[PDB]
């Protein structure tokens, strides 16, 4: 029912200068902290009004951690470049994601922790939170080092403990933002394509959270479905379209499922 | 809140 996630991106920039490191934190689909190694402040910064009430010990601590991660990912970039025999001239990317889900009762549901190299899976914590999956043989080296250091035990304690507890804290402190459910505003548009062909577009606007499903029903897996996109004010938008065969044989309908809707909506032209 | 541990490819 709710989730907290941290996303880390590290990029080597050999032709341009020092590496770049960006960290963002989300609760559900609401970002609440950021750190950009290219920015001037060099501190973790708030991005949601409910996190601003955290005291200076919180901001100092998160800044210390994220600054260490920035340095350490520079070493990782060099290590992985060695593992894969890659030259020093190319730009490469390391990404890390971790966090926890809680159910409707706000109790621990599952934890996550994964790394990617150049946008492909590298190593991931298994669902049981006790062992690792290495995507190729190079990542087995990293697996063996993390197993010898008992990383999974400390990580499991975080994912089932601190992660869940602070997620609950954020959910209460920002309940007016995080526990809301804005229902989709739905409408349909028709536009003529040819003399004997048209297109119907099923819209959905100003909804939160981003999870939504739009399906067309003549009574169809040959349609266009754009990615859910942010409006910019904390809600989301999405549409789907059908290429109807005739100018009037258009007895299709789209169904809109979203937790802000007690029953799935039905739209017709 | 972030996990309080460093972690890398060592």
């Amino acid at each position, epitope marked *: 029912s709710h989730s907290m996630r941290y996303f880390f991106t590290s990029v080597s920039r050999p032709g341009r200068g020092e590496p770049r490191f960006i960290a963002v934190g989300y609760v559900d689909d609401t970002q609440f902290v950021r750190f950009d190694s290219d920015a001037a402040s060099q501190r973790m910064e708030p991005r949601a009004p409910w996190i601003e009430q955290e005291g200076p010990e919180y901001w100092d*601590g998160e800044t210390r951690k994220v600054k260490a991660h920035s340095q*350490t990912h520079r070493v990782d970039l060099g290590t992985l470049r060695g593992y894969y025999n890659q030259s020093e001239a190319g730009s490469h990317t390391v990404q890390r994601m971790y966090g926890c889900d809680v159910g409707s009762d706000w109790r621990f549901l599952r934890g996550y922790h994964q790394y990617a190299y150049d946008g492909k899976d590298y190593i991931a914590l298994k669902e049981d939170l006790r062992s690792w999956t290495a995507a190729d043989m190079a990542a087995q080296t990293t697996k063996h080092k993390w197993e010898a250091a008992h990383v999974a035990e400390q990580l499991r304690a975080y994912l089932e403990g601190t992660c869940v507890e602070w997620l609950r804290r954020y959910l209460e402190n920002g309940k007016e933002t995080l526990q809301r459910t804005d229902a989709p505003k739905t409408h349909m548009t028709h536009h003529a394509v040819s003399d004997h062909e048209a297109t119907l577009r099923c819209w959905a606007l100003s909804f939160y959270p981003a999870e939504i499903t739009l399906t067309w029903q003549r009574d169809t897996q040959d349609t266009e479905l754009v990615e859910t996109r942010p409006a910019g004010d904390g809600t989301f938008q999405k549409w789907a379209a059908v290429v109807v065969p005739s100018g009037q044989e258009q007895r299709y309908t789209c169904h809109v499922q979203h937790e802000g809707l007690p029953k799935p909506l039905t739209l017709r032209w | 809140m972030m996990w309080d541990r460093g972690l890398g490819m060592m």
Partner: T-cell receptor
Amino acid sequence: IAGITQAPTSQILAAGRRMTLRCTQDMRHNAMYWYRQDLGLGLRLIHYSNTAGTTGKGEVPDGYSVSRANTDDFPLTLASAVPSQTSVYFCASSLSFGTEAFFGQGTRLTVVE
Amino acid sequence: EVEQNSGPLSVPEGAIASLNCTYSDRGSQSFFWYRQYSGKSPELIMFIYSNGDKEDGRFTAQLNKASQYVSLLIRDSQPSDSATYLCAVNFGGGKLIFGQG
């Protein structure tokens, strides 16, 4: 016997003199720490280094500097010793920040006028 | 900070000794008990990072992050248990802070 060692074990220092306490470890620990211990105050953190190539200020950093160019060493420098820096100094390291710290032998330093 | 009673505490030889440590930072995620003999360096007794009890021979550590304390229990106190017991708490990013012992 991969461990952590400090040097020197004891030192007498005239006020105003420069002094560096050495601390090295071959455990490939990424985090290192410097503490001073005084009566009634326990251990107070002077400087820390959570990763090779960086340092940070502790509880009582004033009058002390450190550097961490390499994983192994973490030298503590007193640029101009003052009597209040008379103390026992302990270096420590952990595999990573957030994991258990292991301590060196300690350095008994006295600054005299 | 990190708060312990300075002592000195007496325990009869053979009896149970209990030590308590409180801390201020809600964000703290790892906790450590060290033993230090006079003129010597702190030696690690036990670490703990999950709520509950953790047993190691005659030693038991108890952590309650919701109540912001960590405790150490020593069973069948021996002469070699005479020492200063140091509580250490990680405040984030390498800021490892000790109580007064």
